Amino acid sequence: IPAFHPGELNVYSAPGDVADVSRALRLTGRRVMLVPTMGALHEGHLALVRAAKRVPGSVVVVSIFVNPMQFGAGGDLDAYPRTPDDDLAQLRAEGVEIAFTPTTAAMYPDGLRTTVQPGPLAAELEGGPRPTHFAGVLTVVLKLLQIVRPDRVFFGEKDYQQLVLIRQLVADFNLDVAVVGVPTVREADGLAMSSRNRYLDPAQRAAAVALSAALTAAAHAATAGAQAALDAARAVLDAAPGVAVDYLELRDIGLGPMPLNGSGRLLVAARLGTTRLLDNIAIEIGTF
Amino acid sequence: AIPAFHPGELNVYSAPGDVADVSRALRLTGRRVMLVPTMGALHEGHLALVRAAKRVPGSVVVVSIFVNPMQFGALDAYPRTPDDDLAQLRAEGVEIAFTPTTAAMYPDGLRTTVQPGPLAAELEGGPRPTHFAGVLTVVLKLLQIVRPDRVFFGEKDYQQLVLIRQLVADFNLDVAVVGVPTVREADGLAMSSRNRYLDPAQRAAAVALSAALTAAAHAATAGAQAALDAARAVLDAAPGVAVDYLELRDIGLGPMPLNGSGRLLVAARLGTTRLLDNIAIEIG
Numbered sequence: 001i002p003a004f005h006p007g008e009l010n011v012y013s014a015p016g017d018v019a020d021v022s023r024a025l026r027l028t029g030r031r032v033m034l035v036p037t038m039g040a041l042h043e044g045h046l047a048l049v050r051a052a053k054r055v056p057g058s059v060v061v062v063s064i065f066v067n068p069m070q071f072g073a074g075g076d077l078d079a080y081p082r083t084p085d086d087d088l089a090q091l092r093a094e095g096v097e098i099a100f101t102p103t104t105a106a107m108y109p110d111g112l113r114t115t116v117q118p119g120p121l122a123a124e125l126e127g128g129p130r131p132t133h134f135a136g137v138l139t140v141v142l143k144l145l146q147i148v149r150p151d152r153v154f155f156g157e158k159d160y161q162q163l164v165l166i167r168q169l170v171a172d173f174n175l176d177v178a179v180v181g182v183p184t185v186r187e188a189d190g191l192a193m194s195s196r197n198r199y200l201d202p203a204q205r206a207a208a209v210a211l212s213a214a215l216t217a218a219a220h221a222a223t224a225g226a227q228a229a230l231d232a233a234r235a236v237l238d239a240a241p242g243v244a245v246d247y248l249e250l251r252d253i254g255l256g257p258m259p260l261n262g263s264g265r266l267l268v269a270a271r272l273g274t275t276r277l278l279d280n281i282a283i284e285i286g287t288f
Numbered sequence: 289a290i291p292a293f294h295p296g297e298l299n300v301y302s303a304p305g306d307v308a309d310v311s312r313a314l315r316l317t318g319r320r321v322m323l324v325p326t327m328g329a330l331h332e333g334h335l336a337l338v339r340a341a342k343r344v345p346g347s348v349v350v351v352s353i354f355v356n357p358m359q360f361g362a363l364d365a366y367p368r369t370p371d372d373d374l375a376q377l378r379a380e381g382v383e384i385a386f387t388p389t390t391a392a393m394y395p396d397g398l399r400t401t402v403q404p405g406p407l408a409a410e411l412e413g414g415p416r417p418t419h420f421a422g423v424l425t426v427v428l429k430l431l432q433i434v435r436p437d438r439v440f441f442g443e444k445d446y447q448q449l450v451l452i453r454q455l456v457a458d459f460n461l462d463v464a465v466v467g468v469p470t471v472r473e474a475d476g477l478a479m480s481s482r483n484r485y486l487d488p489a490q491r492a493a494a495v496a497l498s499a500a501l502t503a504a505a506h507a508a509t510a511g512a513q514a515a516l517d518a519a520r521a522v523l524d525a526a527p528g529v530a531v532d533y534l535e536l537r538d539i540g541l542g543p544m545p546l547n548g549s550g551r552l553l554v555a556a557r558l559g560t561t562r563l564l565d566n567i568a569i570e571i572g
Contacts, residue, residue, distance in 0.1 A: 015460060110405075114424065114451075114458035119399035138400065146460040172400035174304060174432040 009092045011099045015107070015147045018100045022061065022148050030059040034150035036141055039064040040081040041090050044185040044193035048154040049094045051182045055152065062091055063100040063144050069112060070136030072129075081195050100148065107143065115139045118165055119172075121255055125161050125247065125267060126278070137162055138169050145177055153177050158184040158192050160265060160280040164255050184279075186212065192279045203242070204272040210240035211268055214248075215281040218266050223288045226250060226260065233266065244271045250283060262286070298378045300385045304393070304433045307386045311350065311434050319348040323436035325427060328353040329367030330376050333471040333479040337440040338380050340468045350434050351377055352386040354393065358401075359422030367481050386434070393429065401425045404451055405458075407541055411447050411533060411553060412564070423448055424455050431463055439463050444470040444478050446553060446566040450541050470565075472498065478565045489528065490558040496526035497554050500534075501567040504552050512536055512544060512571050519552060530557040536569060547571040 001024060002017040004010050012018040022032050033052035037045055041064075052060045064087055071077040091099050115135055121127075122134035145153060155163045167179050185193045190212030191205075200208055214236035221232035230250055237245050246269040252258040253265050267280040290313045291306045293299050301307040311321050322341035326334055334351075341349045353373055355366050370387070377385055401421060407413075408420035431439060441449045449467050456465055471479045476498035477491075486494055500522035507518035516536055523531050532555040536544045544550045553566040 019460075019462070110454075110458060113405035114455050115403045117401045117403040117421075135403070143458075143460050146462065149462070168396075169400050172396065172429075174308075174429050176308070176432065176435070 004097075007095075007097065009088065009096055009099060011088070011101060013101050013103060013106070015102055018061065018098065019147050019149070021098070022150075025059050026149065026151075029057065031055060031057050031152075032148060032150040033058045033060045034144065034148050034153045035060065035062045036144050036153065036155070037062060037064055038066045038080065038195075039087050040083050040195040041087045042185075042193050042195060044156055044158060046090065046094060047185045048156060048182050049091070049096060051180060052152070052154050053095060059098065060096045061098040061100055061148050061150065062096050063102070063148070065100075065102050065107065065140070065144075067107075067136060067140045068104060069108070069115075069139055070133050072131075072133065081198065100144075107140070116142055116169065119168055120257075121161065121165055121168070125249065125255070126269070127161075129246070134162070134165055138165060141166055142169060142173070142175075145175060150177055152180050154180045154182055156184060157181050157280070158194065159278070160267060161255060190216065192277075194277065196275055196277060199275040200272060204275065207241050207243055208272055208277060210236055210243050211270060211277055211279040215266055215268060215279055218250075219281050219283055222283050222285050226285055229266065229283060229285070233268070237268070237270070242272055246270060246276070253282075260285070293383075295383065296381075297383065298374060298385055299383055300374065300387060302387050302389065302392065304386075304388055307350065307384065308433050308435075310384065311348075311436070314348050315435070315437075318346060320344055320346045320438070321434060321436040322347050322349045323430065323434050323439045324349065324351045325430055325439065325441070326351060326353055327355045327366065328373050329369055329481045330373045331479055331481060333442055333444065335376065335380060336471045337442060337468050338377070338382055340466060341438070341440050342381065344438065348384065349382045350384040350386055350436065351382050352388075352430055352434070354386075354388055354426070354430075356393070356422060356426040357390055358394075358398065358425055359419050361416055362418070386430075393426070402428055402455065405454055407447070407454070408451060410541070411535065412555065413447075415532070415562075420448065420451050424451060427452055428455060428459070428461075431461060436463060438466050440466045440468055442470060443467050443566070444480070444564065446551060447541060453540075476502065478563075480563065482561050482563065485561045486558060490561070493526040493529050494558055494563060496523050496529055497556060497563055497565040500554060501552055501565055505567050505569055508569050508571055512547075512550075515552065515569055515571070519554070523554070523556070528558055532556055532562075539568075544571070 001020045004021050035048045066080050116138040118134045163181050189209045214233040218229040218233035222229040248268045250264050250266045252260050253263050262285050264283045266283045269278050290309050293310050324337045402424040404420045475495050500519040503522050504515040504519035508515040534554045536552045550569045552569045555564045
């Protein structure tokens with residue numbers, strides 16, 4: 001079995017090495033926590049890492065893999081930011097003991113053969129412009145969960161639809177893992193942290209505050225009902241320079257075939273130039 | 289408090305969480321969990337899977353009995369003999385039977401499912417294009433519920449076996465897949481719950497499938513073409529046997545190599561009953 005140096009960052013690229021080490025750790029009684037990422041780590045990811053680290057007796061595994069299957073054909077895969085050196089430096093500073101950095105060949109030795117087919121939610125919202133996106137996400141997450149076999153897996157609420165779909169995967173395939181959703185980390189003005197924020201020039205960055213301002217205005221207007229909430233958000237978005245809204249939807253919290261009855265989630269997707277930003281917030285209709 | 293488990297007796301659990309809990313507890317006690325997935329209506333073919341599982345040192349055998357709606361065509365006619373199935377398992381010394389309801393396996397209906405690779409559209413996938421997605425989806429679920437060290441499948445459903453091996457490799461599953469040789473009647477007919485539907489004329493003609501395959505296996509010293517031609521000749525000597533396919537492939541069901549190990553598969557309809565068989569072939 002590959003060496004593991006306690007209290008230091010151990011980097012493994014072979015799926016078999018991390019599987020062997022994770023198993024050995026679990027057998028000694030350490031609880032394995034998994035934070036799946038595509039690198040280009042920011043404070044939002046660090047919040048996931050810290051949530052994992054606080055679980056008593058845990059050992060944290062952060063996977064970094066820019067999964068080709070979740071990118072739609074075009075230049076998106078090549079355009080994804082890659083900052084490997086900064087990513088590992090941040091994991092070392094956070095006290096993470098395991099980084100799993102597999103190659104494309106090790107993850108997809110047989111190309112796209114057996115894959116995960118998500119439920120109907122994968123075709124909506126983000127699945128509109130990217131129809132095969134979530135099958136890519138669920139397939140890689142299922143594989144990472146089988147490789148690492150964590151007790152808990154951490155995902156951010158920022159990518160809410162993804163989080164809901166991962167909970168569906170876990171329930172539907174009877175996976176023995178706890179899915180932990182971590183609250184969205186935001187800049188001082190409210191902008192949700194994202195690796196795509198680096199593509200906002202100064203003006204677009206100023207204008208981008210409208211997504212969070214619209215959502216938070218809606219959450220408070222919600223005491224007056226769904227129409228008030230949606231219209232408050234639309235007014236903020238309509239007053240924002242250079243913000244092109246793709247969708248603004250208020251749905252039941254499970255985003256499924258259920259109507260909004262009290263508790264919901266308000267989701268927005270907008271483009272600033274070529275940069276597509278997403279944000280979402282909890283909404284409680286009629287609650288002050 | 290983990291549910292109760294009585295060593296040496298057949299412990300029947302219908303709730304997924306219960307068998308999940310018991311399997312985990314037994315694994316920690318020094319037992320190796322062996323899973324034998326079935327749809328009930330057990331016969332000697334299934335007992336051979338049970339016996340293969342039981343022989344592993346430290347084994348605790350879990351036989352699942354679940355008529356999976358997802359692998360049926362677009363069900364109620366499927367043989368269901370609960371008390372008798374359990375009686376057979378009891379006689380074999382099986383300690384765990386998992387008998388879930390459809391609602392328990394699919395509490396949210398069909399939502400997230402497994403999409404097989406292209407092999408699922410070939411051979412058996414011709415007539416039943418959604419069949420293997422149903423099989424892999426339920427098998428993945430059973431593997432996650434039970435978390436067995438080894439899972440056993442019969443070679444009679446060879447394409448199913450190959451697809452399960454693809455599922456395990458593709459999803460990085462930590463389970464060993466064990467294929468068990470086909471159990472056959474005295475004249476070679478592969479055992480199947482469908483054999484009883486054959487009338488006398490059909491039952492006599494059905495021997496042609498196995499006879500065609502064994503003839504091919506021996507004709508193979510003369511090449512792939514000789515093997516295929518010998519099998520076709522045997523099938524052609526039988527009345528009322530509508531051959532759906534007779535194909536020679538490599539062991540993973542890809543194209544058959546110039547020479548080496550392969551698998552010959554046949555499927556045919558006798559009246560309204562569809563029969564399948566297959567055999568290892570060594571070319572040359």
